[PDB]
Amino acid sequence: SRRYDSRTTIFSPEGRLYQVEYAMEAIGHAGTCLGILANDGVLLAAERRNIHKLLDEVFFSEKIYKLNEDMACSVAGITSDANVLTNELRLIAQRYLLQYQEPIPCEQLVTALCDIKQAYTQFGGKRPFGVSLLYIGWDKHYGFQLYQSDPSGNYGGWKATCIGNNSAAAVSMLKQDYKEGEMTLKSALALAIKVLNKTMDVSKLSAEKVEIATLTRENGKTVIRVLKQKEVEQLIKKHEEEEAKAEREK
Amino acid sequence: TGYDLSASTFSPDGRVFQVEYAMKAVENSSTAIGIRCKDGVVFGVEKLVLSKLYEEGSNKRLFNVDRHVGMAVAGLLADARSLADIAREEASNFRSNFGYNIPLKHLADRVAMYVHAYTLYSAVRPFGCSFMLGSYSVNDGAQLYMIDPSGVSYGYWGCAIGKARQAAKTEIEKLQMKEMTCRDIVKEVAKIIYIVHDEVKDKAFELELSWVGELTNGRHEIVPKDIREEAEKYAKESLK
Amino acid sequence: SIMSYNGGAVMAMKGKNCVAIAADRRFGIQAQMVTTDFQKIFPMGDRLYIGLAGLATDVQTVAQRLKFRLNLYELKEGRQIKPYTLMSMVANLLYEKRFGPYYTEPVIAGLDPKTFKPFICSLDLIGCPMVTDDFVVSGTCAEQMYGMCESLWEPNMDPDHLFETISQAMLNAVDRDAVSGMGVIVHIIEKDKITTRTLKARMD
Amino acid sequence: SSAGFDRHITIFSPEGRLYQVEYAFKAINQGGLTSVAVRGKDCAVIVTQKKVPDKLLDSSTVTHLFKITENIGCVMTGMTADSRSQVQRARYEAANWKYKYGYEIPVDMLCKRIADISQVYTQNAEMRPLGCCMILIGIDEEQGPQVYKCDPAGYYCGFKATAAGVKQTESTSFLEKKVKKKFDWTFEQTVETAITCLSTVLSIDFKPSEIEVGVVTVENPKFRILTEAEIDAHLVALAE
Amino acid sequence: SYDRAITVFSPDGHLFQVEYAQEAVKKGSTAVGVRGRDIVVLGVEKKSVAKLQDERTVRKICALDDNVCMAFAGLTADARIVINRARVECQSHRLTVEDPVTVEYITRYIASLKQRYTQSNGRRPFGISALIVGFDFDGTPRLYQTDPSGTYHAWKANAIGRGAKSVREFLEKNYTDEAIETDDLTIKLVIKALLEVVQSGGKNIELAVMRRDQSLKILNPEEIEKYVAEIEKEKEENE
Amino acid sequence: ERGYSFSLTTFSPSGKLVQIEYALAAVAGGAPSVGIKAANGVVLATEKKQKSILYDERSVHKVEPITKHIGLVYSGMGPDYRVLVHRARKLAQQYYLVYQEPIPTAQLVQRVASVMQEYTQSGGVRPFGVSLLICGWNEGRPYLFQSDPSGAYFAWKATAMGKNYVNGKTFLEKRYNEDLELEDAIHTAILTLKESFEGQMTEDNIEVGICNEAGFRRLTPTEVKDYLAAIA
Amino acid sequence: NQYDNDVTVWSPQGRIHQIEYAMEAVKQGSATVGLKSKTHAVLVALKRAQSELAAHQKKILHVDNHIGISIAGLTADARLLCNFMRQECLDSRFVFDRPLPVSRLVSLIGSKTQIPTQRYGRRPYGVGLLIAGYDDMGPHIFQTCPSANYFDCRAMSIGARSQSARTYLERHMSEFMECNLNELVKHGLRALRETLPAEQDLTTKNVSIGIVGKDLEFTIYDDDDVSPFLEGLEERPQ
Amino acid sequence: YDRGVNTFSPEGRLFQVEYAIEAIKLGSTAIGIQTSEGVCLAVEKRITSPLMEPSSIEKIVEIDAHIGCAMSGLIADAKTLIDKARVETQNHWFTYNETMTVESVTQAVSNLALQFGEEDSRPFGVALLFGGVDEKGPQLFHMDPSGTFVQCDARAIGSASEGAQSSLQEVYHKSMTLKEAIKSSLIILKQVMEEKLNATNIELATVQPGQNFHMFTKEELEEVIKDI
After folding, report:
1. Distance (Å, rounded) from C-alpha G222 to C-alpha G227?
2. Which of A60, A88, A98 has the highest number of chain C CBs within 10 A, making it the mutation to test binding with C?
3. Helix/strand/coil for B87
4. Which spans in B10-143 are helix H?
5. What residues bear N6-acetyllysine in this entry (chain D)?
6. What CATH number did the domain enclosing D51 receive?
């Protein structure tokens, strides 16, 4: 009756939160996602989990979800909890276009989701979302952007982003090797294959363990390029020369 | 034990103790018996005076459900009052939807399913009552029913509810009830109440006798025992 | 009538490997025009359009609700929509307002997304679909458009003669109508490209 | 392995078990009863004893054979109060088939819809899962007679010889030893095996007034309860 | 007597879960605020940018209407709902009554929203504390504060966040009976009070003023760097 | 009822959901099954043993169709299986009334997994104990998916569910390849079902359904006797 | 003690303890005494002071022109049942245009207080109603209880130390049917003075008397008209 | 959990209602005295900071133009009580063209104080003192979170309410005057508070028959303190 009470909503005696601190720990035990700005683009990179040789991968996108027309999102956390969000997130951006006949400007989409994600920590004893996820896009007012969702509902606009206990050490590389102002795509693509070489501890960086999607503003279209496996190979072979140069300065 | 809080849980051997607990709360209630003759049903209730300020016919346990149906409750009295209003209300819908009097075999089914629903959920408890149902008709004869707190309901020829449930039907069964008239039954009910526990651990009691059958023309009402007083004139002759 | 409150005319016609669609340009209340650039043909993906005619409220309203349901469809499925699937989608949207109906009559024209196969259909104001093989028309000046298309249509036509047939059909039928005119726009689409032309019509 | 509240409500334990439903499987066994169903021929036979421990208790208001529809009859084991409410849903939803669909419900389709009601009590919590069991019989056109059996877990199946109650493991061992040879079933062989299997498991060699026989046959497809006289006719016929 | 429900009282008459909400406010960044003669001022501390993010989305001071401001504490998730709700009320008040919204009206709304949100079980109370500053009510500069219990309340100088007891003790010996006119003096009072920061980095101060007739004025970190220079310069002359 | 509506599942301090990992234990303690995507069709096969010689085998079916080109098997507990089957039937017709077109197999698993999602997060109910294998040949290429009581789903070439699935994990990895025919796939599906069966495999101990491009079909015991007629 | 938490939970002895505890809440209030003649039903209650200068809290309260009730127990459930009581009386005036029979009004109260004694989420009503009335068959004195067992009686006293009033009434209940209006009242307030410690006296400011009669509307007297009743008494037999 | 929102004692009252009486004890003190000339009233502010504005702390509110109020215990729940108490006197004027009497105000106020639970929450933590001049002269009442509503002649609540009520019974008699009773009240105030009794710690409220309006004193209170 009353004695089956789950907590989900109760402060600490010191003042911290009970479930929200626990839900952010599961995201460290998940895949790896990141992104970086450019002067003329933005990209995403993902780590493949469960790369066993009896699967199909016929969706052509597993971590990436092209959501409006010019925005996509990565995902990290509980996979089954994430399908509730993305079907909701696609419908927020679409009911906006019915209302104003202009695309959603890439911030108030995020606040529309983050107020839903917050509301399970408030009223109604329920389980919060154990999903953090990224954002890429383009608008009229600011251009290329990155955002960072949290289970608490907090968000921030970044220029290089993070997944935690999996890959918190990548940001230490990102604070070391991200130059400000000039950040173009081939400089950014060569950066990301170096970062995932460190964090994803697969030796020699098998090309089927990664996934890269980019976004470029092109002639008034904002194409979303989910690049195929043939050019992941030459991206690795570009990084293969950087090993040979790394010993010349000894 | 440690499995017996809710009525929605099973024991590790497969029963529900909340139903088991509520049955033996009826056991502490005073004895009320019932018996049917070949042309009617006669009720009888041993009812004890609280102190002295009872006013001679207050809070009676002989109810009157329909034109021809009444109850002989025992247990928690206030719980039986609400349960009697279910049976009063149930017969009115059968009258309004079908245009004739409720059969007693169908009336006991509608009540016992309603008693059954309080034995399932954790939000409510089982009833702490058990009772009798007697009626008479010319197309059906007389019937006598019996409903426990679990909801099991079927028919008897004689029954007893209270402390002396076993000690009363030990001497109900030595009667040739298949051929007696119910006017002969009324003086025979009087001794069975009066045999068991007049004033041994209690102080005083008072007798109540309900009465339905062919002599009442299908009506159900209390006996005229203010008329002729023949119960106590004949039950008290068993002193020797 | 309510259909005669603003006028309008939408025509589609099937060719050999191509399909053409045309409409007028006039927007106006019952007798007074307002503007000559009112859109009545809306793109729904590539090589697949739709035309609307009737009450100008429900023209703009249905075209926004249908675009709402299309973009949710093309994201749960990576493929684009088939022309039969759109016709079943529109007829569902109209029949939901069975007793409060939208006052419009759509016309759908387009090619197959995989093969080259053309497709034309039109619907009623409550959603009775109707596929043909030659032409469909809708609007106030319906009977004028039947008289032109029954005489000028040929079975297998190149995109040159398909353009000239639907031009002569729309120019002669609309000039006989009073509440339709002020310019005619023509979309002719095919497997390789999409051609949009506007014709020299009577502006009276 | 008590973890959380797995011994109390319907949640998963470690090792995938859940205990409240498998507590209900031996919630039948507090009835103290055994029922036997046999399909052998163009007929189908139910047999179940009654137990009358009181002379005051009636004889007609005891029988567990319940007429669902004119062509479908059933027998109930387990506790009585949960059993009769289960029959209320079976009588109710069989008539909804006739109203919605315009013909008579199959015996196969009815046992599904009963088992799906037992599913939600298993699936949802704070709802007690009805510790009783039901066995059906009936004639299906172009299919012959059938016997079905529904669990409190919502698991149903249909099979030839059925035992339910206390003594499944002794009776079903005897029925496989009997039905392994395809002997001729001529509607007296069906009753004779239905009686003598129960007569050896319980070891009684009973008087004609303890059991009942429900029956359906393709010569009179109505459900039919046998009379005390003709039960004795089959009983002295096997008296060799 | 326990501490895991909100409808329960203690044996000495307390609501500990409301009291545990006020502890979560103390883990927030500090913000101060005074009213002046004509120009009001408030400021936040502890920016701490992390070298790789945009900083227009870490906004901690906002405006509800065209003449009223807002500064909060606590956790930033619950602050967004209260701010977004109060924008609707100060807008819908203008519809039903054609006046602009007074500063006293909008703080009763926030406190009453936080009032009824405390009473029912299963509704975790808002762990924020707000500061509402606006010289709106007909040339009269006022500043208020809130509390997670739901007690709107007026101060004349305020401090919240992690270590407000040091600043509130500092302001009592600093706010003179002389009402500081010449409004750059009042900003210098805020800049000196914020100079008693937990680390006092000097560049981690974001101040916002309002001259009672303009819109909101975010100061820039070159004018704000000019005011931090004269603070140590006038302090050197005191020796 | 009272109207409580509190969920029974919360996070551990380690960050795991405990009850969903318990429900997967009930899946592994079920009857074994196997599914193999071949070049022309999909083969499903399960292992159906009655507990006695009394049980009829023409009454209950394991291989179950959804549409005329979509079938569905399981490995878990029998009674919870029949809920989502009847759920997925009504869900498939709602697609067909809107779009006038039979539902593709990828889109069906999108919606069925959202149903199994809803019993985890909502109040007072437990999750399922049934994993699924869904098949079908829509638009030339055939498909084979698996869902679980967590609400997730995958896309397998060939997999096994039930008891001894780690043995069938290794055996199908050594036996299967890129392409076969349908008839080669049924041959290797019985050979991996013969890994954990009883002493005698008959026409009634197994139960096999296939997916031609002509549609879904489950096999009668005439063929399965003739297919297991000494073909391994 | 683990069975002692909810109204729903039966005990292993068959006694629900939450109903047993609401009986104890009736003994917290002061004592009150009701009785009747053939023609007059009089209920007399005892006020209790809160402080030395605060007013005394009232007990007897008017319901209808032929029904008035006394009170013992929680003042929360007092006005809660009173508002239900007054509503039912004017409905029979509105619909049937007759006053209610007093007996079938009390059966509505037992149906009212039954439901919160069985469903979870609501406590029983801790209250001690004594009811006086006039239907067509004369005066009535009724009592209720939080266990919803309403009793017809000819004299009754409930509240704190109310047993000493009951022992007075048993040895004088034969005298009650014949006396007039006057000494029937001071038969009744001879019973309250044994529910008092022997050092203080039944004054004017601490007692209320309500009378409903066969030709008399229900009238509440207090603090000034009690003095025609308090005259003609003896002292306590010490 | 530990005798929750709806559960009896083995002996007596609900403990949650019992614990609600204890929450008043941490409140600020207040004294109201009824006199045949009119009802006076006093309270202590308990101001913490000099930066803290003094007049933002209200204790005496204006229910109606002839009904005052005073509160203690929790500040936050008392704003719920004052809101509908102002409304329901105004509803009575709307349908009867007369002023609601002081007793019949608190009947409607006490109807909402006893509604806690899951029926269609916790009890309140605030006691009240109502002063007013109706047609029966001046009146003074008191309520509590238990809803035990009663009339008093001169009541003191809040912290140190026990020591105030003991000292109050010495100075009171039946033939007081209003100018006497005000300075008789504040002597009791400075004996139970600890700060210096000045014009910033306390405030007064007096209602009269001929002076129905102006239930207030404003820096004439400075004259009263220097005369004691």
Report:
1. 9
2. A98
3. helix
4. 17-26, 77-98, 104-116
5. 98, 100
6. 3.60.20.10
